[PDB]
Amino acid sequence: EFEIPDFYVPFPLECNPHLEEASRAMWEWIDANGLAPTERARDRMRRTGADLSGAYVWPRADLDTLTIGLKWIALTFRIDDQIDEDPARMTAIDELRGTLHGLPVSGRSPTARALGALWQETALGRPATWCDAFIGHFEAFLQTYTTEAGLNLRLDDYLDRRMYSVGMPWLWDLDELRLPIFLPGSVRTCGPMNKLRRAGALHIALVNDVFSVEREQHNAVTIIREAQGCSLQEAVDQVAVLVEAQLHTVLQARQELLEELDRQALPSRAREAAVDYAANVAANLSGQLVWHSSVE
């Protein structure tokens, strides 16, 4: 038992108003692909708030963009779910990874073909530059499963991995689908955008570690606990400090991003798309708080 911090995040609260319509489409796609055959998984799907989660990740998205996003969340839930039924699972991750590079599947493999299909629908006809970013981030995410099972822990090294395991970088890549244009390469990977992406992802992950530690180990509060040996509250306290650091960096990066966008030679609509994307990343940090409060 500990006092969970009352995290302050300044950015306005935003939630996608297409939730109901998109969620029905998600479940329809889940059942048509048979991705939740067991009642335990079906119950846990709606209990964790997988659909609501999407409404807070992409609050500005049109109905069709939210819908594809919810499919990715739903599939990720299944990937995670059937991994939990298990060290021979390394082969399954490598198979999933292959589908992202057009490798046909040999076996029957229900989930691995579902990824192949969703990947095909998401990626084909999109700019290669975007696809490469999305696959790179989604692959990093999948790789954390083999890393985290091989390790079954250092703080600095955990944060490096956690930025990707939390899934935010590939989730934000998908936000580009609703913008009037894709981010130029020069913007997607500029210093301020990289700084924002890392700090944003880590802020959300570390807040997740604090909300999680009751259930529970790959977690910032547990790592700090069984190294120093001090209180659970004292560990949560130090993670709160870490969260605050990430928020300071988010704010700094966003200011630096506007200056960088003004420096770069960009058409106005590209500049405008970048400002919007950044504001959406920031919005996620307030959205998380209300999402957690809702699933309780």
Side-chain angles (χ1 to χ4, degrees), residues 159-178:
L159 296 174
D160 284 345
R161 164 174 80 260
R162 191 61 176 121
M163 147 177 198
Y164 299 108
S165 73
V166 70
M168 303 321 298
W170 67 260
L171 293 168
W172 296 325
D173 290 330
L174 286 170
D175 195 45
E176 291 196 52
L177 267 31
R178 64 95 188 167

Side-chain angles (χ1 to χ4, degrees), residues 41 43-53 77 291 295:
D43 184 54
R44 205 184 66 185
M45 256 288 195
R46 49 208 158 205
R47 272 196 175 271
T48 52
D51 55 357
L52 220 211
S53 190
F77 184 90
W291 175 69
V295 302

Side-chain angles (χ1 to χ4, degrees), residues 179 181 183-184 187 193 196 257-258 261 266 268-280:
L179 299 171
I181 49 145
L183 304 183
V187 176
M193 196 68 82
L196 176 59
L257 180 64
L258 303 186
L261 294 167
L266 298 164
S268 68
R269 105 192 146 130
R271 191 169 277 105
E272 284 163 356
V275 171
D276 197 321
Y277 178 91
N280 189 79

Side-chain angles (χ1 to χ4, degrees), residues 211-238:
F211 279 87
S212 291
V213 78
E214 188 83 16
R215 185 87 287 182
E216 305 160 3
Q217 294 302 136
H218 294 83
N219 176 305
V221 17
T222 79
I223 287 162
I224 292 168
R225 211 205 199 283
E226 288 175 348
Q228 289 164 33
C230 46
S231 171
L232 194 278
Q233 185 65 72
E234 283 156 50
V236 173
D237 282 1
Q238 283 176 290

Side-chain angles (χ1 to χ4, degrees), residues 2-7 207 210-211 233 236:
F2 70 101
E3 272 179 292
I4 197 271
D6 186 17
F7 297 107
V207 167
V210 178
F211 279 87
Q233 185 65 72
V236 173

Side-chain angles (χ1 to χ4, degrees), residues 85-288:
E85 78 193 54
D86 279 331
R89 171 258 293 167
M90 187 202 77
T91 304
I93 290 304
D94 286 308
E95 186 179 56
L96 290 175
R97 284 154 57 113
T99 77
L100 303 169
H101 304 274
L103 218 177
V105 178
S106 284
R108 58 180 207 185
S109 310
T111 309
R113 284 172 191 248
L115 175 64
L118 184 61
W119 168 243
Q120 184 183 143
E121 180 195 348
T122 309
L124 297 209
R126 258 60 195 245
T129 306
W130 179 81
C131 291
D132 293 345
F134 176 74
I135 314 168
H137 285 144
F138 192 79
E139 251 191 303
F141 169 73
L142 255 34
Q143 196 159 338
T144 71
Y145 281 101
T146 68
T147 309
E148 209 138 311
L151 260 305
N152 287 335
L153 309 171
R154 210 177 181 188
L155 179 74
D156 52 307
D157 285 318
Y158 163 76
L159 296 174
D160 284 345
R161 164 174 80 260
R162 191 61 176 121
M163 147 177 198
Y164 299 108
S165 73
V166 70
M168 303 321 298
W170 67 260
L171 293 168
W172 296 325
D173 290 330
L174 286 170
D175 195 45
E176 291 196 52
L177 267 31
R178 64 95 188 167
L179 299 171
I181 49 145
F182 288 90
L183 304 183
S186 68
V187 176
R188 195 181 290 110
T189 69
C190 72
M193 196 68 82
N194 294 334
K195 187 176 172 176
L196 176 59
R197 180 179 301 110
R198 177 180 182 92
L202 289 180
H203 186 283
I204 290 162
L206 292 171
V207 167
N208 277 158
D209 287 3
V210 178
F211 279 87
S212 291
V213 78
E214 188 83 16
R215 185 87 287 182
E216 305 160 3
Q217 294 302 136
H218 294 83
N219 176 305
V221 17
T222 79
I223 287 162
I224 292 168
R225 211 205 199 283
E226 288 175 348
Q228 289 164 33
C230 46
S231 171
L232 194 278
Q233 185 65 72
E234 283 156 50
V236 173
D237 282 1
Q238 283 176 290
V239 174
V241 174
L242 294 185
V243 169
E244 189 192 329
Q246 297 307 319
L247 184 51
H248 285 274
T249 303
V250 166
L251 294 160
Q252 189 172 72
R254 290 193 64 201
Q255 193 59 69
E256 293 165 355
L257 180 64
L258 303 186
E259 286 133 32
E260 175 60 14
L261 294 167
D262 283 343
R263 249 220 338 116
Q264 296 198 23
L266 298 164
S268 68
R269 105 192 146 130
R271 191 169 277 105
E272 284 163 356
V275 171
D276 197 321
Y277 178 91
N280 189 79
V281 173
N284 278 230
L285 278 58
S286 300
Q288 178 187 26

